Structures are given as C-alpha cells and as structure tokens.
Design a protein around this ligand. Structure first.
Ligand SMILES: NS(=O)(=O)c1ccc(C(=O)NCc2c(F)c(F)c(F)c(F)c2F)cc1
Ligand SMILES: NS(=O)(=O)c1ccc(C(=O)NCc2c(F)c(F)c(F)c(F)c2F)cc1
Ligand SMILES: [Hg+2]
Ligand SMILES: [Zn+2]
Length: 258
C-alpha cells in the first residue's frame, strides 16, 4: 500500500515503487566532521524571514507541515552555497520514539532527538512543481533538536498539535515567526542530496546547521502524541518518521567553518 515508516512499508521497501531510492545523491547522510572539507569560498547564509506569512498547519500522515505564503519574496534564503533566491514554502520535523533517535542526518554517527527541515524552492523556476525537476530546485535548512531547556519559539507549534491529531486534519496557523526556531550561529555543512521521503527526488542542496537548538522533554513528548492514521482508524503513534543515513558515494560534504 502507500509508503510509511512501518515494518511493511518503511524505508527499506521504498525502492520498490521509487527506484531512485538507490540513487547517487540520496539523503540523509552521516556527517563525518573529520572528512568534511572547509571551503573558504562558501558565503555566509542570508536568512530573511522578517516578512514570513505562515498560513496553515497540517497533519499529512507522515509529519506535520506548517505552510507559508510563497507567492512573493516574503521569507527567503540566499547566500551560502546557493545561487539565486529560494522561498520558504513549509517546515516540518522528523522525530523519534526515544530521545536518542529522531534526526535523519547524523554527526559522527550521533543521532539527535529530532530534525527540523525548512523547505525552500528556487524562484527562477516559477513554481515548486517545476523546481523539483531541477538539480538545484530546492534548498532545505536542517536544524537538529536536542532535549534540554524549552525553546519558547516552538511552543505555539506544540500547543496547536491537539487540533491536528490525525491524518488530514489542518488548522489555521497565522502570524508564526520562524526566526524563533534558529540557533544563534549559522555555521553549516552543505552537500547535494534529495528529498528524504518519496518521491525521493534528487533536487536538494542541503544546508545542515552545526549548532542544534534545545527543546524540553515536554515539548518533544507532544510531537509523539500525533497519529499517522486518520480519524476512526486504528491508532498508530506518529514516531520514528525518519529515514536512515544513505551512502555518501561520490559526494563531498563542505563546511563553512574550520
Ligand atoms: N503558497 S501556499 O498556498 O501557502 C502553499 C503551501 C504549501 C504547499 C505544499 O505544501 N506543497 C508541498 C510541496 C512542497 F512543500 C515542496 F517543497 C515541493 F517541492 C513539492 F513538490 C510539494 F508538493 C503549496 C502551496
Ligand atoms: N524531509 S525533506 O527532504 O525536507 C522534504 C521536503 C519536502 C517534501 C515534499 O514537498 N514532498 C511533497 C510532494 C508530493 F506529495 C508529491 F506527490 C510530489 F510529486 C512531489 F514532488 C512532492 F515534493 C518532502 C520531503
Ligand atoms: Hg531534480
Ligand atoms: Zn524532512
């Protein structure tokens, strides 16, 4: 049936319907800090989210997405290893059933509690649909979450979760500022990859921040109370919606810092 994260439709089965799963630039990958190359020509990231307009939060059966109005250059990402302007379209998380797992990318094999993905698309392509067909169509900003102190900025997200408990449910989610989810440093690693969920298209430039943000145990606990199923179906807790690290193959991970 449809793909998921369970025994019978999880990541190890994806290749049957999405051959690209065994591709050359699949994500996520493990970031080996001792072999990542410092590239002094990498420009600083330019995150301009002051004009971001969030619209809705949705449980899509795989995770929960917070959607933004991307009809204009309101919230953009430029700089870094990017050429062109990329508009923020949505953000979501991947998390685990336990604090020791949840992230998709790993650093020196270390797994974090969760991983935030801020998804952006290259404006030169006109729409997201066209951007996914290009090798540089998307830019995903990845931020690791570790359990510790509460992140004030994440609480509005946490509080609205009860409203979108099951697949298909959505709630109005305006005036959310994504700047409240960024760590203080924007140092990062970058490599060419893919979407980590089917269709697994290899159109992503990954920008993974070195500094994780901390969230309280109570905050991540609420992520774990969401459901993969729709209303009236057998309850399956939405946990461990992450894909294991893929082989790096002929790729090099660059670092913006020494
Ligand atoms: N401007 S808006 O009306 O608020 C709007 C909000 C969300 C989406 C969406 O989530 N589609 C998913 C989606 C992506 F988020 C991608 F990044 C992508 F590449 C896709 F192909 C895709 F279908 C589209 C438009
Ligand atoms: N975790 S992550 O790598 O940052 C990631 C970000 C966005 C998307 C996404 O927009 N997929 C929706 C989507 C569809 F639902 C389609 F049906 C389709 F054809 C797409 F191209 C598409 F992007 C998937 C994974
Ligand atoms: Hg592509
Ligand atoms: Zn993701």
């Amino acid at each position: 049936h449809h793909w998921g994260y369970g025994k019978h439709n999880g990541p190890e089965h994806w290749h049957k319907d999405f051959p690209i799963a065994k591709g050359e630039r699949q994500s996520p990958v493990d970031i080996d800090t001792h072999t990542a190359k410092y590239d002094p020509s990498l420009k600083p990231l330019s995150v301009s989210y002051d004009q971001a307009t969030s619209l809705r939060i949705l449980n899509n059966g795989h995770a929960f997405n917070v959607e933004f109005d991307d009809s204009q250059d309101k919230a953009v990402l430029k700089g870094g290893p990017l050429d062109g302007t990329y508009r923020l379209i949505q953000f979501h998380f991947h998390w685990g059933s336990l604090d020791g797992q949840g992230s998709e990318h790993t650093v020196d094999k270390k797994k974090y509690a969760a991983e935030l993905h801020l998804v952006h698309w290259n404006t030169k392509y006109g729409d997201v649909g066209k951007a996914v067909q290009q090798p540089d169509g998307l830019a995903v900003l990845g931020i690791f979450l570790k359990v510790g102190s509460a992140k004030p900025g994440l609480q509005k997200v946490v509080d609205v979760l009860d409203s979108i408990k099951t697949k298909g449910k959505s709630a109005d989610f305006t005036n959310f500022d994504p700047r409240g989810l960024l760590p203080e440093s924007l140092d990062y690693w970058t490599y060419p990859g893919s979407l980590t969920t089917p269709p697994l298209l290899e159109c992503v430039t990954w920008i993974v921040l070195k500094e994780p943000i901390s969230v309280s145990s109570e905050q991540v606990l609420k992520f774990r109370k969401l459901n993969f199923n729709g209303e009236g179906e057998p309850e399956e807790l939405m946990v461990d919606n992450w894909r294991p690290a893929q082989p790096l193959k002929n790729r090099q991970i660059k670092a913006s810092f020494k």
